[PDB]
Design a protein around this nucleic acid. Structure first.
Lengths: 64, 141, 56, 129, 49, 191
RNA sequence: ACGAACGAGACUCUGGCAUGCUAACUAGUUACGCGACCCCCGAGCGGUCGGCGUCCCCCAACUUCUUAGAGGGACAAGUGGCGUUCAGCCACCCGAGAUUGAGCAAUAACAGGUCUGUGAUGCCCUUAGAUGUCCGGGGCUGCACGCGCGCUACACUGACUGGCUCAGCGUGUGCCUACCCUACGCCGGCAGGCGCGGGUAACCCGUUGAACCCCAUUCGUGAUGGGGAUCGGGGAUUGCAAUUAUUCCCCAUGAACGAGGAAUUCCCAGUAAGUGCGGGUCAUAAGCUUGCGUUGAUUAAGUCCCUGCCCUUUGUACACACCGCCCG
């Protein structure tokens, strides 16, 4: 198992719904990878432009 | 008259009235020394504008303020609003626009929070609750 | 509101009546009605009025 | 910010933009001080909202043929446009091709006209099944 | 797309999966294939795409 | 907008970013600066203005939690500037940048919600929004500063200054710096 | 489907943009005549600058402030985006940007509560050994448990004494029959004794010379000067009368307590909380009520996942409606 650290620039957020943890679905583009697109989830204040912090480049959130 | 400015200012309710006056240049809050309201922790508070509005524009002003009401830092923003409120008309009405230009901008260059204070206040207690919004707890058996 | 007493017992009566007068008569309330606007005699600017004068 | 507005202003607007329109303002401040004299209401709450929605009306007035108000300018202009000059169109168009089926029909009438015998005969399978 | 990123061929013609999915009526209700329709709207039809 | 930015004891500019993923949430130049912070919570307009609310005002206003202690506010700010001075004295360099990097190093990373796959309560990890990260760091270092001067000898300022020393300048030296690994390992195995 | 209402919007108060409006010798001011008193107060120990809730007698004066009448704000108003530009929504310049909160008050009815607010009120009941009536003592306050509403905290941001830094709520003298809001000095320590006096209230307390934020100060993580009862010993104080401390004050008694597992409430903004002060009860009077008021916080701007209104489809042996019928 590998844990690539990454800086996920959120290209859009998708509403604060679905799960009641004030989560938020995101479609980051890591500034770095081209054909890897991990669609993820966060919790709380997220605007487009600032990279979310990542220990592991592999947390794909679609209820998985 | 045409030679000084005596108008009001206040926090939520603590009300001061400041009078900027032509003279040698003196500052007095409550008819008492400037710092010496003496919160003794906010000794730093009421000389930020006094040292950032123009030491030149604090050379001809003889500040006398008449104050009452409420609490300590509330009265501090009372005077801090009042002095600006007086000096703005001191500059615009009696005096030209170039003299205005500096301090009208320094208004927000500190903050716009001073020309008019909070439109806020504490309001009436609502019964069934120990304050304005809380509620007395709902018991059972 | 009113009561009545009977050999069989009490009855209760309530009467709620609008006030009659549109104007402020004796029991007439305020002149306006809490409702929409209307026209009594509005004004337009329709008729041709073109350059000539009158000298009075 | 704001809220969706009421019947007391819907009526108060679709009366004044009907009658007072040409004498009605173009901006809010004007609308409100028009309301002061030619409005009769028990408050300023209704008056402020009337003036806001009349601001809305002038936003909507000169905005093309508009279906959310009615005024004289609109009434006349649409009627006057309908008052129209038919261009040369009794023939309705230039040379006309028609079908041999129509010609054989008009044989019963023993009728014809400016004709070219439009041919559109074979079919490629028809309405979808 | 990831499968294409590290692949021998660029990206392959992707043989699909084709299935004749079956439900019972009650499992359709439990698993949301469709739901009810009005006392006339049951007559007209719109199956899931 | 002043001609010089000072505390009467050290400078007020020279604040930067360390882990870019928290840019525009740690705030030191929003639109001004003061001799010493004080506010009502005026920035309470939304989530965004409290996201970009200044950090020194953030902590100075936040440090009044345990009830009646917002009923002693002047002396509490006396304590906060005391603690910044204690850092300035013990460890030397300017305490505000050091606390910036300490919040960075004691920020969490992920939070796991409760969505049972087949019914049993599990956890699922979502990336901590950087604002919630910085707030967990500050507002659990405050929890540690209370748990210290509650069950120890050290006063409030001394506890706070020790924590800001040993957070960035020490490992496993904070209640927050253990909450951090707890949360992140929970996120790992509970993905 | 049309022409109609009531319930919402409307009907009011409160807080907020008012450097322009309206004037009070019963209010303040008074900026003006440091004039009369004051200190030289100070560098200076002079001209003057600083401070007098110090006065001017009043037939000087004004409402900046001031209590506030009307005049008048604010209506998605504009525009940057969306819709169908429908009714509107986020934002920014004009800043008060919508909406500060308090109020006002339905149709059917519950059989929930009101006859111990009543001579509101039908039956019957008590009707001279009274449940009508005046009064005395006791009871409504007795404790092996359970519960809620509760004040004080569990101490170091503890906090002890002393200084000085800072109001508006409202009542305020005989009543529909007995006791109205305050202040001065003389004593004991405070409680408490004393008499002269202001007042039917912008007159007067009170420029409520309000606390907790302030600071000097301390011993030192020590059931520890804490959290501070219990009970002892007295002192006054109303009252016909405090004995099972009704209240006040002291010496002094020095305890149960280390932020609490069983369930749950509350608030996402001068709002919680900390919180001194008012006002209702009175011969005695608040840990209650409900307002004044300050020092003012953690994250939140989403969602019905938990408990809950309304909507539509839609099954029903239910017609007091799932706490219902119901079956062997």
């Amino acid at each position: 198992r590998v844990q690539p650290i990454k800086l996920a620039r959120v290209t859009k957020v998708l509403g604060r719904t679905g799960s009641q943890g004030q989560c938020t679905q995101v479609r980051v583009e890591f500034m770095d990878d081209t054909s890897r697109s991990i669609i993820r989830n966060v919790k709380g204040p997220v605007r487009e432009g600032d990279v979310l912090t990542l220990l592991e480049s592999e947390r794909e959130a679609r209820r998985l | 008259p045409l030679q000084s400015v005596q108008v009001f200012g206040r926090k939520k309710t603590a009300t001061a009235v400041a009078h900027c006056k032509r003279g040698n240049g003196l500052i007095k809050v409550n008819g008492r020394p400037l710092e010496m309201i003496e919160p003794r922790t906010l000794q730093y508070k009421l000389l930020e504008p006094v040292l950032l509005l123009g030491k030149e524009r604090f050379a001809g002003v003889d500040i006398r303020v008449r104050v009452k009401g409420g609490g300590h830092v509330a009265q501090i923003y009372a005077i801090r609003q009042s002095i600006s409120k007086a000096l703005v008309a001191y500059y615009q009405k009696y005096v030209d626009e170039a003299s205005k230009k500096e301090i009208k901008d320094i208004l927000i260059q500190y903050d716009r929070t001073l020309l008019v204070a909070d439109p806020r206040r504490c309001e009436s207690k609502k019964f069934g609750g120990p304050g304005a919004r809380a509620r007395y707890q709902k018991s059972y058996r | 509101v009113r009561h009545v007493l009977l050999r069989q017992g009490v009855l209760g009566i309530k009467v709620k009546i609008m006030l009659p007068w549109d104007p402020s008569g004796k029991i007439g309330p305020k002149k306006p009605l809490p409702d929409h606007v209307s026209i009594v005699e509005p004004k337009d600017e329709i008729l041709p009025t073109t350059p000539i004068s009158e000298q009075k | 910010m704001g809220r969706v507005r009421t019947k007391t202003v819907k009526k108060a607007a679709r009366v004044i933009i009907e009658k007072y329109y040409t004498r009605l303002g173009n901006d809010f401040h004007t609308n409100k001080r028009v309301c002061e004299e030619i409005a009769i209401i028990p408050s300023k709450k209704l008056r402020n909202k009337i003036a806001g929605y009349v601001t809305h009306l002038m936003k909507r007035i000169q905005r093309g043929p508009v279906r959310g108000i009615s005024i004289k300018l609109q009434e006349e202009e649409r009627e006057r446009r309908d008052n129209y000059v038919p261009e040369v169109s009794a023939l309705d168009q230039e040379i006309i091709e028609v079908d041999p089926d129509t010609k054989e029909m008009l044989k019963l009438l023993d009728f014809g006209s400016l004709s070219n015998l439009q041919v559109t005969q074979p079919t490629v399978g028809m309405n979808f099944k | 797309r990831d499968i294409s990123e590290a692949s021998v061929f660029d990206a392959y013609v992707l043989p699909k999966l084709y299935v004749k999915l079956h439900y019972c009526v009650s499992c359709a209700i439990h698993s949301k294939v469709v739901r009810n329709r009005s006392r006339e709207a049951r007559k007209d039809r719109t199956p899931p795409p | 907008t002043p001609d010089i930015k000072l505390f009467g004891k050290w400078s007020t500019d020279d604040v930067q970013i360390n882990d870019i993923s928290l840019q525009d949430y740690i705030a030191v130049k929003e639109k001004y600066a003061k001799y010493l912070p004080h506010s009502a919570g005026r920035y309470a307009a939304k989530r965004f203005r409290k996201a970009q609310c200044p950090i020194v005002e953030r902590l100075t206003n936040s440090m009044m939690m345990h009830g009646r202690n917002n009923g002693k506010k002047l002396m509490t700010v006396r304590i906060v500037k005391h603690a910044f001075e204690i850092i300035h004295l013990l460890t030397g360099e300017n305490p505000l940048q050091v606390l910036v990097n300490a919040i960075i190093n004691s920020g969490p990373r992920e939070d796991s919600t409760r969505i049972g796959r087949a019914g049993t309560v599990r956890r699922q990890a979502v990336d901590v929004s950087p604002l919630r990260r910085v707030n967990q760091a500050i507002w659990l270092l405050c929890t540690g500063a209370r748990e210290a001067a509650f069950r120890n000898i050290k006063t409030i300022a001394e506890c706070l200054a020790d924590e800001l020393i040993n957070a960035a300048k020490g490992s496993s030296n904070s209640y927050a710096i253990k909450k951090k690994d707890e949360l992140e390992r929970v996120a790992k195995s509970n993905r």
